A paper describes a structure:
In this study we report the generation of a panel of mAbs that have arisen from infection or vaccination, binding outside the NTD and RBD in sub-domain-1 ([name]), a highly conserved domain adjacent to the RBD. A triad of three charged residues, K535, E554, and E583, forms the key attachment point for all these anti-[name] mAbs.
To determine the binding modes and details of the interaction of these potent neutralizing mAbs with S, we determined high-resolution cryo-EM structures of complexes of BA.4/5 spike with [name]-1 Fab and BA.2.12.1 spike with [name]-2 and [name]-3 Fabs. In addition, the CDR-H1 and H3 of [name]-2 are two residues and one residue longer, respectively, than those of [name]-1. [name]-2 makes a footprint of 660 Å2 on [name], slightly smaller than [name]-1. The disulfide linking the 6th and 11th positions of CDR-H3 makes hydrophobic contacts with residue L533 of CD1. CDR-L2 is not involved in interactions, and other CDRs make [name] contacts similar to the corresponding mAb [name]-1 CDRs. Mutations T323I, K529N, T547I, T547K, N556K, L560Q, A570D, A570V, T572I, T573I, and E583D had no effect on neutralization, however, mutation E554K led to complete knock out of activity of mAbs [name]-1, −2, and −3.
Residue numbers in the entry:
A (entry chain B): 743 to 1038
B (entry chain L): 2 to 110
C (entry chain H): 1 to 124
D (entry chain A): 22 to 64, 78 to 141, 149 to 172, 183 to 208, 213 to 239, 261 to 673, 686 to 742
E (entry chain A): 941 to 1038
F (entry chain C): 545 to 594
Write the structure that this text describes.
């Protein structure tokens, strides 16, 4: 509606500030992912022979068969979280006919709310994690400090045992038992991820909060905010210029307030997500790229 | 589905004949979108009535259309040997689909 | 003067596929004003609507025949094509390509301009 | 000799009289678009005026000596004439009978003949000072009954520099101008409504401008409110497909509504026994109601009178009665009083109109008109549109009345005493209340609006029974029940509608739209850009040969330029290469762009780094034999600016 | 080189400039200038227009302060990190990787 | 308005009657009788802390 647009021009730069804030959040998401996962100077790869002192890394190493090159556990995790909107292409046909009515995404799009895709694809993130894993299991903590220096995995475990105050002959004399305990623990992780249905609660909560915020924004368009109608077309077809302008101003003020509330909550949730991402990057540096002495 | 149409009807010159076309309540009784078509032998069907009772440009007014309930009707007044063809009824059935009638053979004595 | 001309094969054995094609002269199918439909007339039975296509590629098919039917359109050559598979003695009929007015050009839901018709026969 | 050439960046003028210095100001006005196609006349038919005219001339001989403006250019209509004398300039708005090829002859006296045969019924006069090579530029605008002339003179070696046109004169002449002609090689261009970003230097002069709608880079500059752009990707305005046609679909109704018999009734009802008439299955022209009664104006709630002809209603109700003037305010939603409580109650959610007019000449008598009555006593208040015509004795006290009046037993109805000598507040007023029922059931009362054809599969404006909108209409497979006339979605917007004539169900879909991003290296590097249409398929990318069927007015040739389809949308103007580089400008979904060597913008899948096969084995160890002392920098913000706001000074000044 | 500090400075300057530019918005009033409203209108209608301007400018101030609070929280987190780095990297030798 | 009026060195063109600033407040004005250009400056103000 051009009448509404001309009236909205009189409220200054509120829309541009909202757009700038949302753009800042969107850029920060890619920055978060890059800081967590791009902590490697090279894409490390293991040799084709996959014996590491009897430790079985098969369920966390990449599966070359699948298109995504994800690991088995990464596949379980990926199927465990259901995204509401990935940000990929939506064509005419998905939002035409009887299919739009049964989809909230089409209504969101039709009211100006869209999802942008992440800069890093899932395949690229899986490549980063596989490089980190290959570096860790082939070179220990050396690749975090410089060039990756290969070391036999049992000897690396002897180093780690020394790191916690246990003599390395304890590792060497119990090598089969330690490998078996690790293999059983990994198998338990895999079984728990396969069986239990709500393991990834925090990620699902992030997805659900975003979807709920967008749905609330969409539903706010049916509020009258004191006007005769929540539909601009009804106001414009039922009233003359001046009274229609009054009603449209009421609708504009209400919808502007709803947008401002959405953007403010997005900024606060983005700050929380950024703190979580900084923690994840610190944990990648200190737990994956090294052995940590910090308790818990 | 199909629209029930009489197999054949007959009449004498100068008299009007009524051809019926009965459908369900979702095709004929649901819209004002009934069409009538005439098929002379060795030719393609020609539209004679659209929107129940409207005439395409260049169609004689003697072909009248009507609808009652779930039935449509085509009335031919001043019947002549020119009106010796096969008459079909068509109805919009919803969701962009169409249902045609069985067809009536009009014979002139 | 709008003309519709069919050129499909008229001899198809059972368990095969039709390849009917209808070209249009005097009008641009790319204008999107009309729909373009295929209608069959079997011997003894009345007319039957198979389906329709639109310039944007949207189609609407007869629910009974939807499984084994496909209607396509080429705006470059100004034609639309019908492919009916699982050919059987029920499929022998006179096939017309017809312009359908969907209220966009005056007449509402009327099949106004008809093709000449091609006799498709089914036999071993 | 009509040739065609390029206007470059000529024709910018000062939009207003406000001084501005060292600023960038955005103005929407009638400007000559940058790099527009202007016509070079080396010369004579009369040229059109359009919205405004840009006129340039590099002549030195001063052969060009004025202009003529008008519509008919004869004595039938007034026409503006401007003549630049060798000592002055004279402007007139007489009714000239202009010649077919007017020109000023010199023989030194300069004859005003050979231009017009006569100048009759003059209505304006004005005299002022007269207006390498010397280029002379003028802009003529005819707005707000005012002829504005801007001008400038520039020494040249149409140049490609910048030179703003100062306001030269403003004339308060309210005449029609659609054609114009020169008086004796000149350039003529036409103005369009454009948004410009003008740069005022320190001295107050406009030294540069950006035409926002010229191309994607200019739109980026206008969005950033800057003349230079850093490398990056910027979300500019969104593309929208504009409607081609407007369609109106109303029910086929032929009868005319009988409002005249409502208004032109010999006797009106009493307010306690108010008359109600049903109006249905007719065409209602509400503009003719002014001719039936001498009322001053409508009083409408939920609707405007001038809009009533564009609407359709399921039913209309006309209630007629008579009250006195000081009770007219009681005929309104949410009112209290004798009439509102005991005689006639309007609902709180009333949508309709009230028409009350003085009827002293018809409803007053010298002895007093006692035919009109009102209920004075009732046990409870009336409900809206409830009629009480009872005459039971009112029992005010606890003592019963037994159907006989007396003390505390009043007859509930009291008569007005309308007399011609009463004041206007006590004089009779005839009242007609029109109640409208909107939406729900199919409409039976409609305005005098002609129904067009029902156009599908195109972006159109539509009006279904007063329900207006814009979108694409298609056949719908929604299973509407027979009583259902439209369908709504989550945002309470109509997404399906039943056609009032064919009774078919139509899906309503918004016209094609989407966000647009401009990818640029710095303007300090190149002016080339790429354009990302976000979340659209390259086949559905908007290509619009017409300038009124799409909002972004600039056109980047989709098929012509490089086209690539990323999961972030369709990228136009960047060439996709199979090499992998470090990300430079993020596009999304693993795709980045950069300005690289001929230099152009290239898109590519971003690289995560070089592969490194670690030479792991059962008994191999790598041990460093040397070391490097590394010094690296980490930068951390600690504090930000401490700000204070005087709230009262900001909001209210002094 | 010092992009983050320049970004902090630029964000503050942009927020203040946006606040200043919001004073030219009408917010539905006849004018964005209080003096024009007071010199052109009587007491009651001028009060209506002034109320519109007050509501708009109050909203702009509230938006500025909310964004300032959020940016201050981010700056405080950065300062806490800097103080931890001063304690653990300058005043001692750290074993924490990276 | 309210403020302090001083001689202005802004180069007003003859058709210009007043000047505006970023906040769309008049900061310069041409005197209707003498036709001179005057700068308008806010009266002295500032915050106070105890
Ligand atoms: C590693 O674990 C997988 C899954 O538990 C198993 O199928 C595989 O045989 C194991 N590898 C070895 C060498 O035992
Ligand atoms: C000029 O006359 C035309 C009719 O010829 C009319 O449409 C137009 O509005 C008029 N313009 C003015 C400014 O009077
Ligand atoms: C303003 O005018 C002075 C001369 O009075 C001149 O020196 C200066 O360059 C001018 N400003 C600009 C931006 O050119
Ligand atoms: C673009 O449209 C074509 C044809 O409709 C389709 O085959 C293709 O998949 C679409 N693009 C994408 C990225 O899906
Ligand atoms: C990249 O490779 C594809 C084959 O997968 C080829 O079609 C394309 O032309 C190549 N692009 C360039 C820039 O060579
Ligand atoms: C490494 O040791 C394992 C276990 O004894 C053996 O299977 C493998 O072949 C060895 N690799 C080489 C290269 O000798
Ligand atoms: C170690 O490196 C330094 C500088 O790179 C070099 O000068 C020195 O000779 C090296 N020492 C050995 C033993 O290689």
């Amino acid at each position: 509606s051009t009448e509404c647009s001309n009236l909205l021009l009189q409220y200054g730069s509120f829309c541009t500030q909202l757009k700038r804030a949302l753009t800042g959040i969107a850029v920060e998401q890619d920055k978060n992912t890059q800081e967590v996962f791009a902590q490697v100077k090279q894409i490390y790869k293991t040799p084709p022979i996959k014996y590491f002192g009897g430790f079985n890394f098969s369920q966390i190493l990449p599966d070359p068969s699948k298109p995504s090159k994800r690991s088995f556990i990464e596949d379980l995790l990926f199927n465990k979280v259901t995204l509401a909107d990935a940000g990929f292409i939506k064509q005419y046909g998905d939002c035409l006919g009887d299919i739009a009515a049964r989809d909230l995404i089409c209504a969101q799009k039709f009211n100006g709310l869209t999802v942008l895709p992440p800069l890093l694809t899932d395949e690229m993130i899986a490549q980063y994690t596989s490089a980190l894993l290959a570096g860790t299991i082939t070179s220990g903590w050396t690749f975090g400090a410089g060039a990756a220096l290969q070391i036999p995995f049992a000897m690396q475990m002897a180093y780690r045992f020394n790191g916690i105050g246990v003599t390395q002959n304890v590792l060497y004399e119990n090598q089969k038992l330690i490998a078996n305990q690790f293999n059983s623990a990994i198998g338990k992780i895999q079984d728990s991820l396969s069986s239990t249905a709500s393991a990834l609660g925090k990620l699902q909560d992030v997805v659900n909060h975003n979807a709920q915020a967008l749905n609330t924004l969409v539903k706010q368009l049916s509020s009258k905010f004191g006007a005769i109608s929540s539909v601009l077309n009804d106001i414009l077809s039922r009233l003359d210029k001046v009274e229609a302008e009054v009603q449209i101003d009421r609708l504009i003020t209400g919808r502007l307030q709803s947008l401002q509330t959405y953007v403010t909550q997005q900024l606060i949730r983005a700050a929380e997500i950024r703190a979580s991402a900084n923690l994840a990057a610190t944990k990648m540096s200190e737990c994956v790229l090294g052995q940590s002495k910090r308790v818990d | 589905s199909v629209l029930t149409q009489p197999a054949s009807v007959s009449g004498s010159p100068g008299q009007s004949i009524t051809i019926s076309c009965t459908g369900t309540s979702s095709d004929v009784g649901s819209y004002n979108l009934v069409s009538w078509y005439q098929q002379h032998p060795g030719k393609a069907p020609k539209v004679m009535i659209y929107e129940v009772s409207k005439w395409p440009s260049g169609v004689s007014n003697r072909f009248s259309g009507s609808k009652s309930g779930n039935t449509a009707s085509l009335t031919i007044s001043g019947l002549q040997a020119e009106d010796e063809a096969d008459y079909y009824c068509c109805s919009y059935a919803g969701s962009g689909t169409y249902v045609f009638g069985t067809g009536t053979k009009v014979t002139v004595l | 003067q709008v003309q519709l001309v069919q050129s499909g094969p008229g001899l198809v054995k059972p368990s095969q596929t039709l390849s009917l094609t209808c070209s249009v002269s005097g009008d641009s199918i790319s204008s999107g004003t009309y729909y373009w439909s295929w209608i069959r007339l079997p011997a003894g039975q009345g007319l039957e609507w198979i389906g329709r296509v639109h310039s944007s590629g949207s189609t609407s098919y007869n629910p009974s025949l939807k499984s084994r039917v496909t209607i396509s359109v080429d705006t470059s050559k100004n034609n639309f094509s019908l492919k009916l598979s699982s050919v059987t003695a029920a499929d022998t009929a006179v096939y017309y390509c017809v312009r359908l007015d969907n209220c966009s050009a005056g007449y509402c839901h009327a099949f106004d301009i008809w093709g000449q018709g091609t006799m498709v026969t089914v036999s071993s | 000799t009509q040739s065609y050439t390029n206007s470059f960046t000529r024709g910018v003028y000062y939009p207003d009289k406000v001084f501005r210095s060292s600023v960038l100001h955005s103005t929407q006005d009638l400007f000559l678009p940058f790099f527009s196609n202007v016509t070079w006349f080396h010369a004579n038919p009369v040229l059109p005026f359009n919205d405004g005219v840009y006129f340039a001339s590099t002549e030195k001989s001063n052969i060009i000596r004025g202009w003529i403006f008008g519509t008919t250019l004869d004595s039938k209509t007034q026409s503006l004439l401007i003549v630049n004398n060798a000592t002055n300039v004279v402007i007139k708005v007489c009714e000239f009978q202009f010649c077919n090829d007017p020109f000023l002859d010199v023989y030194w006296m300069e004859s005003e003949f050979r231009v017009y045969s006569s100048a009759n019924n003059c209505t304006f006069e004005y005299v002022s000072q007269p207006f390498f090579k010397n280029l002379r530029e003028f802009v003529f605008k005819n707005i707000d009954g005012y002829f504005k002339i801007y001008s400038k003179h520039t020494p040249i070696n149409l140049p490609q520099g910048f030179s703003a046109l100062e306001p030269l004169v403003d004339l308060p002449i309210g005449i029609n101008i659609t054609r114009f002609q020169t008086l004796l090689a000149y350039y003529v261009g036409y103005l369009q409504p454009r948004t410009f970003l003008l740069k005022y230097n320190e001295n107050g002069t406009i030294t540069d401008a950006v035409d926002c709608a010229l191309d994607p880079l200019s739109e980026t500059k206008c969005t950033l409110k800057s003349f230079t752009v850093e490398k990056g990707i910027y979300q500019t305005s969104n593309f929208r497909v504009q409607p081609t046609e407007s369609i109106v679909r109303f029910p086929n109704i032929t009868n005319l509504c009988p409002f005249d018999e409502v208004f032109n009734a010999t006797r009106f009802a009493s307010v306690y026994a108010w008359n109600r008439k049903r109006i249905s299955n007719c065409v209602a022209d509400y503009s003719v109601l002014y001719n039936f009664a001498p009322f001053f104006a409508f009083k409408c709630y939920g609707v405007s009178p001038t809009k009533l002809n564009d609407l359709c209603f399921t039913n209309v109700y006309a209630d007629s009665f008579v009250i006195r003037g000081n009770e007219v305010s009681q005929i309104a939603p949410g009112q209290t009083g004798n009439i509102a409580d005991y005689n006639y109650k309007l609902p709180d959610d009333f949508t309709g109109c009230v028409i009350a007019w003085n009827s002293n000449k018809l409803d007053s008598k010298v002895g007093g008109n006692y035919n009109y009555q009102y209920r004075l006593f009732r046990k409870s208040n009336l409900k809206p549109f409830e009629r009480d015509i009872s005459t039971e004795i009112y029992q005010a006290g606890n003592k019963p009345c037994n159907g006989v009046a007396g003390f505390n037993c009043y007859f509930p109805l009291r008569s007005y005493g309308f007399r011609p000598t009463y004041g206007v507040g006590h004089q009779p007023y005839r009242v007609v209340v029109l109640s409208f029922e909107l939406l729900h059931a199919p409409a039976t009362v409609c305005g005098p609006k002609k129904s067009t054809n029902l156009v599908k599969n195109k972006c159109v404006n539509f009006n279904f029974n007063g329900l207006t909108g814009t979108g694409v209409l298609t056949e719908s497979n929604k299973k509407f029940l027979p009583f259902q006339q439209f369908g709504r979605d989550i945002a309470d917007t109509t997404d399906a509608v039943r056609d009032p004539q064919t009774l078919e169900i139509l899906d309503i879909t918004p016209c094609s739209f989407g966000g647009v991003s401009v990818i640029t290296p710095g303007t300090n590097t190149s002016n080339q850009v790429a354009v990302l249409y976000q979340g659209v398929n390259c086949t559905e990318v908007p290509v619009a040969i017409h300038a009124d069927q799409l909002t972004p007015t600039w056109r980047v040739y989709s098929t012509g330029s490089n086209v690539f389809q990323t999961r972030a949308g369709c990228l136009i103007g960047a060439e996709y290469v199979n090499n992998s580089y470090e990300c430079d400008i993020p596009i999304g979904a693993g795709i980045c762009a950069s300005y690289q060597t001929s230099q152009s913008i290239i898109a590519y899948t971003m690289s995560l780094g070089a592969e490194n096969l670690v030479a792991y084995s059962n008994n191999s160890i790598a041990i460093p034999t040397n070391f490097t002392i590394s010094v690296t920098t980490e930068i951390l913000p600690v504090s930000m600016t401490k700000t204070s706001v005087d709230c009262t000074m900001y909001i209210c000044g002094d």
